[PDB]
Design a protein around this ligand. Structure first.
Ligand code: E1Z
Ligand code: K
Ligand code: K
Ligand code: ZN
Length: 360
């Protein structure tokens, strides 16, 4: 029978901001999501995967030992040193429990990828924090210490074969700069991100997120950026991006495992995204990805700051993984012109690499 795995560990709530108790990357993000899965009776339908700590050797699959050593050292720091260290990065706060929580987020995901790859479960959801996709090989960034999704892709290959094909779909409203960079020269890991860009004025504020960054060397064509410009986007724009880009490229790539860097900050009500993707929209995207890799899909929480929006959106993704009927959504709504421009720009930049793509 198809089983859905779920991993959650309340110890990941220990990572906190001691200088701003209302910082948006709240410990309550994961507990509210977990409680909503209980209320909707989704949790009881899942196989509970145990959380674990990632080892330093596993962190070294993507990160430098210098970076690992510095984050590890924060476990023993006084508040004044935690404040100073956090200030060395772009948008990071650290507590003595941060390192442990980042290890738990990655270890939880490794156990989930292992459960899927060994056939213990068909697919899985990881309700983890702190997030990972902005973390680079050598630095923490944007609430992220280690790149959980990137590490999970490498971990998956370490327990199978180096050439295991992993698709990472990053639907967090922000560009996963760390994920792109880690796999930029790699043809074994296809990275597809959709993200608010605003001509480089939206976090992480780099032209690296533009559609013309297609990958390097043997990785040329294996990096797909779908940047949004022109304000609020929603379900029609995301469905069109999946229809014309994400799914044709994914099918041509033929992944053996699908990781979703599932931020829910493109959700309706999120003040850090300003977008309108609905829980039914996220459900549709999850169900489309389930048609890939024999259903081998692991959904990894990234960002998403409206407690109610993320709890509803992520629960709807789990509902899809469990085999519930997908929402009836169509492609009849006209897109905002700027979203058409964005999709056409990606189609043009990726036409050389992916024969199945349409011109416009
Ligand atoms: C890091 C983050 C979201 C992360 C996330 O959700 N990861 O996916 C949001 C922060 C508040 C932000 O908006 C910001 C904007 C500009 C900036 N500069 C120009 C230095 C620094 C930070
Ligand atoms: K993204
Ligand atoms: K790549
Ligand atoms: Zn985000």
């Amino acid at each position: 029978s198809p089983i859905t795995g779920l991993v959650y560990d309340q110890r990941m709530m220990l990572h906190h901001n001691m200088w701003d108790s209302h910082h948006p990357e709240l410990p309550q993000r994961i507990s509210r999501i977990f409680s909503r899965h209980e209320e909707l009776r989704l949790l009881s339908r899942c196989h509970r995967i145990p959380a674990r700590l990632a080892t330093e050797e596993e962190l070294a699959l993507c990160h430098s030992s210098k970076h690992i050593s510095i984050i590890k050292s924060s476990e023993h720091m006084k508040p004044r040193d935690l404040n100073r260290l956090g200030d060395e990065y772009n948008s990071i706060f650290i507590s003595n429990e941060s390192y442990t929580c980042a290890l738990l987020a990655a270890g939880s995901c490794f156990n989930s990828a292992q459960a899927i790859l060994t056939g213990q479960v068909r697919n899985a959801v990881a309700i983890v924090r702190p997030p990972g996709h902005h973390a680079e090989k050598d630095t923490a960034c944007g609430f992220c210490f280690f790149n959980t999704a990137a590490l999970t892709a490498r971990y998956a290959q370490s327990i199978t074969r180096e050439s295991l094909r992993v698709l990472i779909v990053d639907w967090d409203v922000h560009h996963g700069n760390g994920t792109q960079h880690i796999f930029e020269e790699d043809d074994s890991v296809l990275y597809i991100s959709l993200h608010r860009y605003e001509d480089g004025a939206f976090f992480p504020n780099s032209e690296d997120a533009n559609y013309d960054k297609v990958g390097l060397g043997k990785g040329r064509g294996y990096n797909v950026n779908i940047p949004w410009n022109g304000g609020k986007m929603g379900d029609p724009e995301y469905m069109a991006a999946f229809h014309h880009l994400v799914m044709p490229i994914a099918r041509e790539f033929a992944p053996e495992l699908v990781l979703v860097s599932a931020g829910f900050d493109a959700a309706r009500g999120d003040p850090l995204g300003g977008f309108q993707v609905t829980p039914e929209g996220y459900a549709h995207l999850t169900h489309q990805l389930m048609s890939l890799a024999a259903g081998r899909v692991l959904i990894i929480l990234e960002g998403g700051y409206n407690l109610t929006s993320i709890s509803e959106s992520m629960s709807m993704c789990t509902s899809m993984l469990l085999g519930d009927s997908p929402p009836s959504l169509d492609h009849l709504t006209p897109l905002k012109t700027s979203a058409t421009v964005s999709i056409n720009n990606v189609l043009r930049a990726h036409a050389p690499f992916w024969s199945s793509l349409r011109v416009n």
